[PDB]
Structures are given as structure tokens and as C-alpha cells.
Amino acid sequence: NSSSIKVVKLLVRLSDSVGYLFWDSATTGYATCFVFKGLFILTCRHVIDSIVGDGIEPSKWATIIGQCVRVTFGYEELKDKETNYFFVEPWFEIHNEELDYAVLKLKENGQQVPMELYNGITPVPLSGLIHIIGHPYGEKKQIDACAVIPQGQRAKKCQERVQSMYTQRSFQKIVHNPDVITYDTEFFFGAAGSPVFDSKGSLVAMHAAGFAYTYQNETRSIIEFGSTMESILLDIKQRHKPWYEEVFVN
Amino acid sequence: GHMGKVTKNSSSIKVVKLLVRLSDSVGYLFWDSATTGYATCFVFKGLFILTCRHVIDSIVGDGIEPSKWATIIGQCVRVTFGYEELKDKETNYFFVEPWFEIHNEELDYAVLKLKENGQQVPMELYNGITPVPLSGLIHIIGHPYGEKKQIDACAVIPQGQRAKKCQERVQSKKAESPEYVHMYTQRSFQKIVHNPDVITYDTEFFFGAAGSPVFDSKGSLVAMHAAGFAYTYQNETRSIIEFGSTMESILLDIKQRHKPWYEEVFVN
């Protein structure tokens, strides 16, 4: 579970591109995001669901996002929670519900936009150590070193953890899913959109959600998963090819 | 790990940035004497660095006259602060002055002095006296197994549980098979069971990390990692519990036994 000083020195520099996204309009909430490419940031899709609310026509979604969403990258202490924030352009076009990702665009306000975290496609580790950087529980920015659950063991672990709410009939969407990476982390609450890097510090996935339960007045989670950057970028290449060529190759 | 009773392993970005700043003051100490070996040290105060006493025992050797120890140290010990990759293992190193006067066997600490050879002396890690945490999370920075510099976030074992937890692991692994064995004396384990001068924790730096600085959850130097209680099972070597001498005890011992040097170094 220990890491080398070199990798952690890389990770703390990368953490400046991990942001806290918050909104306070008709709905109130938070999430984690990160600078994907250029002025574009990446987060989860159910985050946008929380931002807009139920029963709203899609034609209005962008207008809502550009009116109430703020993103700050310097949230390391309580005082910095809702200060020095970028606005978001009223634009919402690149997303997918299955892979659970959403692309937003920051609005330049004369500040320094953090370095992009997408350096290229990095293969997903089948085992070993990973590092998740985000804002769990809406708290200050934190980093966690986590153990990866190999896909072939996903069906086992779950059934153990239930026998040691839900059923094994409910994990059917992640047990044999090669587009997600499973792991045991403490960032299982409100850390949607937190980047997940491999043991060398390369962006490999984005944390999605978990499965919460209560035990001795404390909220725990059975298993956590995230959408792999390979899957997200391939879906973007296929569904939004003009935007992909406009942003990524030039 | 969220299946049993677990302490939070994660840290905040602010504390981790502080710790990567402090790691530049953690040094890999290697020696080529009658025996060849390695350990960890850290810049204590000014040019002085702190490591473990049994490290000096391993450097000098058995039976050597004490009057020679210093002269051996300042001739064979080298310390590098940039061992973050394999290529930097024994590059850009300081020598140590032929000086060995401040040490203690019971608390297992030893003070050495770097020799300014043109290299950059790191920042000292001793700012003030920090109370020892009774529980929670700590961070160890060092060179375990002689590898590149690493940092581990570990769970503190409260003092009152030292007698409990340990046995719970012993009887857990010992009941299985008759090939289990401890590699430590019980007389050596009973010296930390009710000892407030050491802090105990569960870490992965139970090898070659002697002298590694141990910081609290906020990033303040609180202890120096000493040793562990190793046990082998199925030909794999684990450790029941690890411990470190608190900086409180070390500084008190320095004030009591070496008052002139303490006033010469710390107050003036």
C-alpha cells in the first residue's frame, strides 16, 4: 500500500488539476472533476442529473449548468471551499449514461487553467495499487492509495462481503464489465469524478460510485468502481468524432 | 479496506505536499566497512542527522574498541538525500564527521554530523516538540529494503492494545502448523508493551527502514522508526507490530544527558 516519493511528487502536482464542482440553485450539491483536455473538464453523468433535477427538458440543461455550476481547483483547506472558482460555459454535448461521464467547458476569467491530465491512453492495471484524488464527503482535497479488485474476483469478493439492501443479482452490471475498474477505497461517498491513476501516476480511470450500507452507525461500502479512460475516450472517438478531431489531434 | 474495523489510510493533499517537502530531508545512509549495509536517517538540527543506535552497532562491528568507533564512522558512512530512483542510490553523498557522542541504547537513537563537501544540506525536520498521538494515522518516510525513498501511511496501535493485538496475531498464525516461529525474544517484546517512550503501529517498513522519520496525521515529526517483531510463516517474513522512539523521549534524554551540547546547538 506504500508508494515511492517520486510517484507521490508526481501525484501532488497532478492534484492541482483535480477540482471541486459545486452548485447552489434549485438543487444544491457537489462533485469532483478534473481537467481533461484544454479548457474541458470531465466528471460523472449522474452529477449532471443531480445538477439539473428531475422533470426538466434537455433543451434547458446547458443553460442551467452555465448558471449555477462553479469549479475550484485550490480547495485544500476549509477556507478555500468556495473561492477562486471558474464558471462553466452553457454547453453540454459530450456525455454517456452507460459509461457515466460528462464533459464541461470552463470559462476563462483571467486565471491559470490547470494542466491537462490526459497525456494519452494508458492501459488499465489488472491488479496492484492505484491512487484516487478527489473531494470525498465534499471535504478538502484528498488522495487515497487503493487495492484493485481483479475482474475475475469481482463475483467472489461481493458474495463474500454480503455473507460476512442488495443481492448478487444487483452487481450484474460490473461483475463482467471490462469497461470499469473495481477497487476498495475510502472515497465511496461524493467522490464521483475523482481521477484514478495507476501505480506510476498515469491517469487510467474516473471513479464513478459505490454501494453504501450502514454498520455500527457508520456508513461503509461493499465495492467501488470507475469508468476506464480507455472506454471513455473510445466512446468519444466513436460518438463525437468531429469534436474529437477538433480538440485532440490538432 | 472497508470490511472490518479500519482506520482511515487516506491523507489530505496539503499534508501530502508537506510530507513530500520533508522527504528531501530523509536520507539513505549506506556504509562499506567490515560489513556492508544500509539504513535511513534524517536531518535533525542544522548539520546534525539522526538515525538508530543499532545501526552504529552494525557499522562498527562486534569487539571493536570504542575509541575507534568515531574514526570508523567518519571513514565508511555515506548519506544521500536524492535516492528516489535506482540510479541515484549512491550518488551525491555526504560524508560524516568522525564524531559519535550523542546516543542511547534503550531509546535506540544516534546523532551524527554531516560534513559540508559542497552539497546542499537539507532542511532540518525538528521544529518543536509535538505530542505523540494515542491513535489514528501516521506517515513513515524512509528507504525500506534499501529501495528508493518511499512513504507509508500507517495505523497507530494504542498502547493499551499492545499486549492484546500482538497476542491475537500470535495465536492466530501459531495455532496453524508447527513450522511457525518468532525471530525475536520475549524479553525484547516486553520492553515496549507498557513503554510510553515508543509509539507502535502497523506498517510495511519493517525492514532496513531503521531511522525513518514518523510524522503525525498533520505532518509534524513525532517519532523515529526503530524496528519490528518479525515472524516467518510459509517461508514469508511478516511482522507482528512495529515501533519507534518518540522525539519527546529522545529530546528529553538529550537535555538530561548532554545539556552542554543541547544548549550549544538548540538555544544559541
From Swiss-Prot, chain B:
It is found in: Nucleus; Chromosome; Cytoplasm. Autocatalytically cleaved; activating the protein. Autocatalytic cleavage takes place in trans. Belongs to the FAM111 family. The active site is at 54 (charge relay system), 108 (charge relay system), 210 (charge relay system). This is Serine protease FAM111A. Induction: Regulated in a cell cycle dependent manner with the lowest expression during G0 or the quiescent phase and with peak expression during G2/M phase (at protein level). Upon virus infection via the cGAS-STING signaling pathway. It is linked to Kenny-Caffey syndrome 2: A disorder characterized by impaired skeletal development with small and dense bones, short stature, and primary hypoparathyroidism with hypocalcemia. Clinical features include cortical thickening and medullary stenosis of the tubular bones, delayed closure of fontanels, defective dentition, small eyes with hypermetropia, and frontal bossing with a triangular face. It comes from the Eukaryota. Residues 5-268 are annotated as: Interaction with SV40 large T antigen. Interacts (via PIP-box) with PCNA; then interaction is direct. (Microbial infection) Interacts with SV40 virus large T antigen and this interaction is required for efficient viral replication and sustained viral gene expression in restrictive cell types. The chain holds residues 335 to 599 of 611 of the full protein. Single-stranded DNA-binding serine protease that mediates the proteolytic cleavage of covalent DNA-protein cross-links (DPCs) during DNA synthesis, thereby playing a key role in maintaining genomic integrity. DPCs are highly toxic DNA lesions that interfere with essential chromatin transactions, such as replication and transcription, and which are induced by reactive agents, such as UV light or formaldehyde. It comes from Homo sapiens (Human). The PIP-box mediates the interaction with PCNA. Disulfide bonds: none annotated.
